[PDB]
Amino acid sequence: LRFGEMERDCMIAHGAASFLKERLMEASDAFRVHICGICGLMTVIAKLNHNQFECKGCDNKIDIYQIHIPYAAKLLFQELMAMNITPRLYTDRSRDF
Amino acid sequence: GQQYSSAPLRTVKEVQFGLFSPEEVRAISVAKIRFPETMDETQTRAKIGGLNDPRLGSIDRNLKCQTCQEGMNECPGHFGHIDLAKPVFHVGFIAKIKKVCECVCMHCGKLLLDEHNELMRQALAIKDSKKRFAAIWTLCKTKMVCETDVPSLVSRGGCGNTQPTIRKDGLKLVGSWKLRVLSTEEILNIFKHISVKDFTSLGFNEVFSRPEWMILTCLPVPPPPVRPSISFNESQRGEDDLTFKLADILKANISLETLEHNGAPHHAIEEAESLLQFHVATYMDNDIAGQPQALQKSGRPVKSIRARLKGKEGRIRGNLMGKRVDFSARTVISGDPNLELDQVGVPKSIAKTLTYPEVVTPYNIDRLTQLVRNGPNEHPGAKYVIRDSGDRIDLRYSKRAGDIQLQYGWKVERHIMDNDPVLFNRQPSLHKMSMMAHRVKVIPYSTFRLNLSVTSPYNADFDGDEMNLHVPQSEETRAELSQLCAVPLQIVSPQSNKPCMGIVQDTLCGIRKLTLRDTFIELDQVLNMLYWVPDWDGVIPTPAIIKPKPLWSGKQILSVAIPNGIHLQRFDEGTTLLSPKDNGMLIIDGQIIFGVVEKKTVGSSNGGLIHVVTREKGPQVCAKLFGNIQKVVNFWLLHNGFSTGIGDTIADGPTMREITETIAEAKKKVLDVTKEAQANLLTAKHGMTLRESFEDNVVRFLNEARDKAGRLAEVNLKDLNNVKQMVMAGSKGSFINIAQMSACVGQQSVEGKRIAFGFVDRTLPHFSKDDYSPESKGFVENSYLRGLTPQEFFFHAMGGREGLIDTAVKTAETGYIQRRLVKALEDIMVHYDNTTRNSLGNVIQFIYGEDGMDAAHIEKQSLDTIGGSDAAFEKRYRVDLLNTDHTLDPSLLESGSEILGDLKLQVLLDEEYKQLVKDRKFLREVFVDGEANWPLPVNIRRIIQNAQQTFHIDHTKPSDLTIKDIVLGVKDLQENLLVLRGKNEIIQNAQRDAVTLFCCLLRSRLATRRVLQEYRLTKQAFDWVLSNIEAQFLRSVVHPGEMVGVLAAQSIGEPATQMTLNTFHFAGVASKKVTSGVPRLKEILNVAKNMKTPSLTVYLEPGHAADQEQAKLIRSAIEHTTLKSVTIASEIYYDPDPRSTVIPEDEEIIQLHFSLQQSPWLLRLELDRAAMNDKDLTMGQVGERIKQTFKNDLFVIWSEDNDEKLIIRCRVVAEEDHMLKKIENTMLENITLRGVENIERVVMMKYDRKVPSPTGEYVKEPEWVLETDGVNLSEVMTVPGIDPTRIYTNSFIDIMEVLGIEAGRAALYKEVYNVIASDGSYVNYRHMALLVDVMTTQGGLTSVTRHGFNRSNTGALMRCSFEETVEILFEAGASAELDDCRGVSENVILGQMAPIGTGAFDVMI
Amino acid sequence: EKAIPKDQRATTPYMTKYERARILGTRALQISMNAPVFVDLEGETDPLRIAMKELAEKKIPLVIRRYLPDGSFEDWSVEELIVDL
Amino acid sequence: NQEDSMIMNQSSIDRGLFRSLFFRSYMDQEKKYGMSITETFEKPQRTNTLRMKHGTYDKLDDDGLIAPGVRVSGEDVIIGKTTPISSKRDASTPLRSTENGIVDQVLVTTNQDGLKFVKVRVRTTKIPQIGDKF
Amino acid sequence: IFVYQNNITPSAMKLVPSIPPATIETFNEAALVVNITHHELVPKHIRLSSDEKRELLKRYRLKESQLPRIQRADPVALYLGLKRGEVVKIIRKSETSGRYASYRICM
DNA sequence: CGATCCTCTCGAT
RNA sequence: GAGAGG
Ligand SMILES: [Mg+2]
Ligand SMILES: [Zn+2]
Ligand SMILES: [Zn+2]
Ligand SMILES: [Zn+2]
């Protein structure tokens, strides 16, 4: 059954942050993607079981992170990249200055 | 589900939007992509080294993927690249390209106005990567030249080239010089250069987004998971549109590569160049300015990535904001008298499909073993056992399914069991009460059963409705449901600061029937009724009657269901403590003393049993009170019976005769008025037509008749009448229903008027032309009992249809309103500093609701100091110890006689009194009309009543208190009512402010004389009350984490859905025609510049406002009057002799107008005597006004005001004949005789007004008020005779422009409030205040639209979730925006715990 | 950095409904996963009813980090926070 | 019987009040095209196939169809068909997952193109239950 | 304070700020016939000092941007003659608390 | 560029 | 796409 926007809204009003996350992740999608620490893109060549990762272009091999997002969000970010848009996902609030 | 990763787990804290460098696309790439063909290379079953696969994901569930391996459901897919032969544009960026092109010089490659221009200097200074560029473009788009050098001469970089007048054509650009088309490779060369300093000023980022990157050089090739295959038949292909379009762009690219390094036909090469562009761009976005797309064996056109993300069933709305979920269930719903309020009846098959993942602990191991032993087919069972490693053991197939020796740390996916928290829901979810947590109760049968008293929040009925159930899959997720979402926690709602659940239907009906003084019960039934109550003490109450037979009253046995320490007092109309009619309500210690129990006591009412019991006993006890009352009443009623038949619609032979004559007299009123209208005797009132006046009268007579006939019927109905019985209880039906079924259905309306002449001059071809009679225009004389005639039948069907048509509209329209409201306020929440803030950290309110109180902990309380006379106030609050008649009697105090005289204690009583008189003045300045009842936290009356019972106060003995005990006691209590806590002055004054009105209430209720003479409290009881107020006040405060934006949105939105009729019920008078309901609510929210009903409401000079004459004068002074409005006809005669008329009537005028050259052409106007009298006009005024226009170039003569026919004669002081006909136009159309422009119609109205009398009390003192059609606030407010202090307009945009943002805000609230109030609905102040403040905080009026709120400084991922999805995302990349990920939407998109309630703080060790 | 000292805390000395729910939930999760129990369960088995007991007897060893809109936080212990509600 | 519910007499339901028959026809044809490539109505076994539904095919006769009078429920395959992939590929038709009843009539005919085409009628008797609308 | 009666030429409009630190404020006589500040709907606005603004921002841990806003050409801001950056305190009557203080910043 | 929610069934490409 | 359900 669809847990639409309107239902998403009632969970916010109740302030049920975890239940709302669970509906949108554990029930439904939820996917583990590998992110580059430099470009912050889903570039990272997931070479599991052989402990290798690496992001070509960035010449990165150590600065890698794993995020838990909906497959639909992963799909979206890829579709934005398909339209030449960079949805750079960063793991630290760092606004540097 | 996926493998283990060594890489550290972290959430997303920022989203840096940007643009891909072609060099970055090539670097990121894994595949070359040279071939347009799929995978079949000359029949061979593999993949081609061109399109899809060459190192980027398998499409055959093969663990192989270019060394990375992983296989599907683990591989994210990898990006490949494609080298474009010649540069191409981007569909979305096309507009930005042209805009950037009108800012930079072609050849030169530099910005046009740096940095001497005293416009561009100010424009450059503005902080924004969008609002800066907005000013810049507008400034240098006018420029046609690069400029050699600049003024103080000052020489700088600037060539001598004329900038083209760029124009967009199809999907290309055309430049005008004073010609030649603009090349995609040409535009790049300019953009490739620019300047890092200059370009960052025009909204770009050196790192993330450059304008040279808006043009495509290298296109990113999406992997197969983005564009997957798989069909219905396993013999053919079945490719994605995206794949077909990428093959199409490749065919176009290889063609261009061929032609370039082959015979280039000069102009024929550009025919293939324009087609490569109509592919690259059309794959990203179809549905543009040019043409659509092709078949390609599939259902034409191609969707494109743009369409994929486009809202409502699109990637954002349909997949991210909402999505289909597991652990969900659905069915038809049924009521259950025998189910607890917080319960839900779950069909056994559903309980057996849905599971909970329980970890094996020593506390459950025995129960889990047994459940695993029962398996998936026997109810308290399970399907699946998960061990270490994560392997699921399928209990329905495993050979070891009957073996299984559980181990701690394993999980058992057990069936849904009794008492599990579940989320129960009914769509549409307009409320948070539409989605509540219930306790599972596994039952036989295929429906979901629910307690009847939960029907209202869900807006559920059992006529086929279906509801949804969601299962929490985590311990914390179950806690969230049980501790925040539970049904008992929702009983008293913040929407309208009152219960949203109450006793309904059979229970509401039988509770009345049971409660009658006449209703008595015998032992046998009593015993059964008592046992039916689960909380029963086992003690048989002593029967009301002990004489020939013990006989218990209904009130007695129902009081068993009411818990102890419950006090309730009411008073209806004739209620007098001896309650003759058995009306009102008096409950002491949960025993009903008097008062028939109905809707006012036991419904969703404000200060009823339910609101009281929740506050007094608690939510868990209140939810038992539902069942307890249901159980007794349902049983008593089951044994009593209740019906309704045709006989209940029948009134007396005599009543019918009286109804029949009531209608015939109405029929004559309409005839007399008709006959009068037709004789030209009926005079029309100022502001309305003779025909409008007639229609208004006829409809009133006709409505009067239905109401009079109906009241005649209602009176005739006996108390044994079943319809009357249901109306008395308040379970179903109202007056109308009785009237329409028994007496007369009445007038039918379409578009607020009686039945229109759909045929020429008649409503039906059974009538003659020009028939305005009741029967002819839709008056249903008959009742549903008597039956309707065909004419009546048709007309009723016409009226009926208008209802179904707007029902259908006032659902899709309100649904859209609700969405917009929710989206705009989504992110507003109460922070840890009691502040009200959005995702940006911007302040909306400094204290939530202005008092920092939770709406569900607030109730309407009287402010005792505001009302009454100055003498009544004195008698109530004054204590003069230095007066023998005005002290406290020694029977009120232990110190009574010891204090008479005093002096030192009178300084304290004078301090007490002065603050009370100060309060009275203050309240009268806040609440001008003198309304005392206001929603405030802490019910003082209830606390007082509780101390009275708890301490067993005897109103005979004197109190042990002191003036100091009372006066200082109350004073210290005030210093303890915390809403805020900071030791600073800003915060201390904010705290002082928040608690002002409550301290008023408190002082009025806890004054010395009241505490002593009225309440008669002891020191014991007084000190308990003092601590109870402090504790309940502190409980009443809003909790930081409260999602008030969504609350407000839903609190306004929900009632709007329930707004019945777009046409207002003001059907009597035709001058009451102001836009209301959903059309108005839409005008307000969209901030419509062109509203349907703009209106000024004019209050006269304070004097002087009772003067009916002064009102008529201000009306004619302000109502716009032109010459057209007073003129019958205008004529042009040839009267050559200026002092001798050709017109014999005019002779007398020419005799005069000589003492105290021209033209032989006369312009002669005839004026209307009545119109001149309706307006405050005299010929002299009209004449001197014509005279003061053309002055010397026209000669004006006129007839006297007494002179029979009103005439104005004009003359012009070759080619003359036309000039005069031209003048007449200006004379009529362009001349103001008197009045204010835009103010069309002004009407005089007598308004009621509560004003303080010279003795203190509020008195009704009526006042003449002017009501306008049209608006000119600025001009009307300066008219003498008005009260410029009280002038009002429903055009809040004008109040904003004239008076400022704060007055605009107050007027915007008044507006929103009125829409809600006109519908009879009530919404708490704080919800509409929050809306109005949000629309206001920017200094202007920001609409709840894509234009309004959606264009603000908020996160790109949160804006795209609303509307204009793709375009928001395109400008985000181009401007190289950063998203905080501080908003709800970005966290929903990220599948992360949002900083809302539960996640609005961190939990550490 | 950032942090407010114990002395200078201006947020409610009262536990919010959202704090209590998240507290009880987190602790329920722990107990559900064979974590040690800081109170004598008197025939109690449901992880939540146990967490409710540990809350009632103030034996929950957790700290609520209260963020203010600038980014500063106030650390409050379950032990110190008053449970009215 | 509140908020639009109703109380129905079980005894009169036992005597037949508001009881109804329910019929559902399932259709299939042997292919759409293929000069040599033709789908077949048969009871499918191994023959490398593995693309089976199961839902027991066990109620099917050698023609790939169930005889009228057999009780069907769950996802029991009612029409057995294969697509020739050059071994077999499953094209069998299961009974609606939620439905059950008795095979009523089984029609074997030919289309205008000469296509062996079948219609299977299944029969349920629906007795008035708790969430039924009247 | 220049009090014009009918209109100002846009030529004269481009001479208004050309002489700082002094300020020139133009008001149409017609706009001043009625003092807007006396209207029911207009609450009291208090131009708070540079130091008061400093304390306000400190006390609520704010940025100028995070504060509710008032337009330069706002009828009330013009009456008070507010400059951009200046903060005004709006003390208004409240049905909820009696008294409520909001704050707006000039733009 | 917007145009209630959710739910079902059907037929046809 | 249409028909429907609350
Ligand atoms: Mg319904
Ligand atoms: Zn990288
Ligand atoms: Zn891979
Ligand atoms: Zn140049």
Q: Which residue, among B433, B1085, B1042, has the nearest Cα to B819 in the 3D structure?
A: B1085
Asked if residue A66 belongs to a domain, the reply is yes
E98-106 vs E69-70, strand pairing mode: parallel
Tell the residue number behind the tokens 């029902």, with chain if given. B807
Among B463, B1137, B1248, B1402, the active-site one is B463
Task: List subunits contacting chain C, requiring 3 or more Cβ pairs under 8 Å.
Answer: A, B, E
CA pair distance C46, B1211, nearest whole angstrom? 103
Chain E nearest C-alpha distance from C76 (Å): 20
Q: Which two tokens stand for residue B887?
A: 């002290």
**Coil, helix or strand at residue B1358:** helix
- Residues in CB range of C52: below 8 A, 6 or more apart: C24
Tell the residue number behind the tokens 């036992």, with chain if given. D14
Give the residue on B whose Cα is nearest the Cα of A75: B226
CB B1126 within 8 A of CB B1234: no
Domain covering B505-639, topology? Enzyme I; Chain A, domain 2 (1.10.274)
CA pair distance B404, B398, nearest whole angstrom? 10
CB B564 within 8 A of CB B533: no
Among B116, B193, B639, B1065, the active-site one is B1065
B462 in reach of chain D (CB within 8 A): yes
What is the count of structural domains for chain C? Answer: 1
Distance, angstroms, CA B1146 to C1' F12?
Answer: 85
Tell the residue number behind the tokens 């209140």, with chain if given. B622
CB B1234 within 8 A of CB B1279: no
Chain C nearest C-alpha distance from B754 (Å): 56
Q: Please tell me the distance between residue A93's alpha carbon and the centre of ligand 3 in angstroms.
A: 29
Q: Which residues of B860-888 are buried (b: 16+ CB within 10 A; e: fewer)?
A: ebbbbbbbbeeeebeebbbbebeeeeebb
Contacts of C69 in chain B (CB under 8 A): 831, 833, 835, 837, 841
B1248 is catalytic: no
Q: Please tell me the distance between residue A78's alpha carbon and the centre of ligand 2 in angstroms.
A: 15
Residue nearest to nucleotide F6 (CA to C1'): B427
Chain A nearest C-alpha distance from C70 (Å): 14
Element (H, E) at B1226: helix B1217-1229
> Domain span at residue C66?
1-85
Rg (CA), chain D: 19
Element (H, E) at B257: helix B241-260
Q: Which residues of B545-580 are buried (b: 16+ CB within 10 A; e: fewer)?
A: eeeeeebbbbbbbbbbbbbeebbbbbeeeebeeebe
**CATH classification at residue C14:** 3.90.940.10
CB B85 within 8 A of CB B256: yes
Give the residue on C whose Cα is nearest the Cα of A13: C18
Q: Please tell me the distance between residue B84's alpha carbon and the centre of ligand 4 in angstroms.
A: 30
Method used to solve the structure: X-ray
Q: Which residue of B9, B28, B1385 is the best one to mutate when testing the A interface, meaning the one whose CB has the most A CBs within 10 A?
A: B28
CA pair distance B220, B907, nearest whole angstrom? 86
B1263-1269 vs B466-470, strand pairing mode: unpaired
Enumerate the known binding-site residues of D for Mg(2+): 4
Q: Which residues of B929-957 are buried (b: 16+ CB within 10 A; e: fewer)?
A: ebbbebbbbbbbebbbbbbbeeeebeeee
Asked if residue A69 belongs to a domain, the reply is yes
Tell the residue number behind the tokens 């003067």, with chain if given. B1107
Q: Please tell me the distance between residue B981's alpha carbon and the centre of ligand 4 in angstroms.
A: 63
CB B1330 within 8 A of CB B825: yes
Tell the residue number behind the tokens 């109730």, with chain if given. B859
A18 in reach of chain C (CB within 8 A): yes
What is the count of structural domains for chain A? Answer: 1
CA pair distance B1101, D88, nearest whole angstrom? 97
CA pair distance B30, B57, nearest whole angstrom? 11
Rg (CA), chain E: 16
- Residues in CB range of B968: below 8 A, 6 or more apart: none
B775: left (phi over 0), alpha (psi -120 to 50) or beta: alpha
Distance, angstroms, CA B299 to C1' F13?
Answer: 8
Q: Which two tokens stand for residue B539?
A: 């003690």
CA pair distance B1288, B1302, nearest whole angstrom? 14
- Residues in CB range of E92: below 8 A, 6 or more apart: B1302, E43, E44, E99, E100, E101, E102
* Interchain pair A12, B220: CB under 8 A: no
CB B1265 within 8 A of CB B1245: yes
Asked if residue A91 belongs to a domain, the reply is no
Distance, first Cα to last Cα, chain D: 13
- Residues in CB range of C60: below 8 A, 6 or more apart: C23, C27, C38, C51, C54, C78, C79
Query: Which nucleotides on strand G sit less than 7 A from a protein beta carbon?
Result: 5-6
Please report how the helices B870-877 and B904-926 are oriented relative to each other, as an axis angle in degrees rounded to 10.
140
CB B461 within 8 A of CB B475: no
Cα torsion at B791, B795, B800, B804 (round to 10°)?
120
> Domain span at residue A43?
1-85
Q: Which residue of A12, A18, A26 is the best one to mutate when testing the C interface, meaning the one whose CB has the most C CBs within 10 A?
A: A18
**CATH classification at residue A16:** 3.90.1800.10
Counting ligands in written order, which one lies closest to the CA of residue B224? 3
Question: Which residues are placed with Cβ below 5 angstroms of ligand 1, an ion?
Answer: B 461, 463, 465
Q: Which residue, among B436, E33, B815, has the nearest Cα to B448 in the 3D structure?
A: B436
Chain C nearest C-alpha distance from E98 (Å): 23
- Residues in CB range of B774: below 8 A, 6 or more apart: B666, B667, B670, B698, B702, B747, B781
CB B864 within 8 A of CB B852: no
CA pair distance A23, B471, nearest whole angstrom? 9
Strands (E), B20-99: 80-88
Strands (E), B37-166: 80-88
Contacts of C72 in chain E (CB under 8 A): 61
Domain covering E35-107, topology? Eukaryotic RPB6 RNA polymerase subunit (3.90.940)
- Residues in CB range of B359: below 8 A, 6 or more apart: B409, B410, B411, C32, C33, C34
List the beta bridge partners of residue D117. Answer: D29, D109
Q: Which two tokens stand for residue B37?
A: 């063909």
B448-450 vs B328-335, strand pairing mode: parallel
Element (H, E) at B1225: helix B1217-1229
Asked if residue A30 belongs to a domain, the reply is yes
Q: Considering the domain B1108-1242, what is its CATH architecture?
A: 2-Layer Sandwich (3.30)
Distance, angstroms, CA B461 to C1' G4?
Answer: 19
CB A33 within 8 A of CB A25: no
CB B739 within 8 A of CB B714: yes
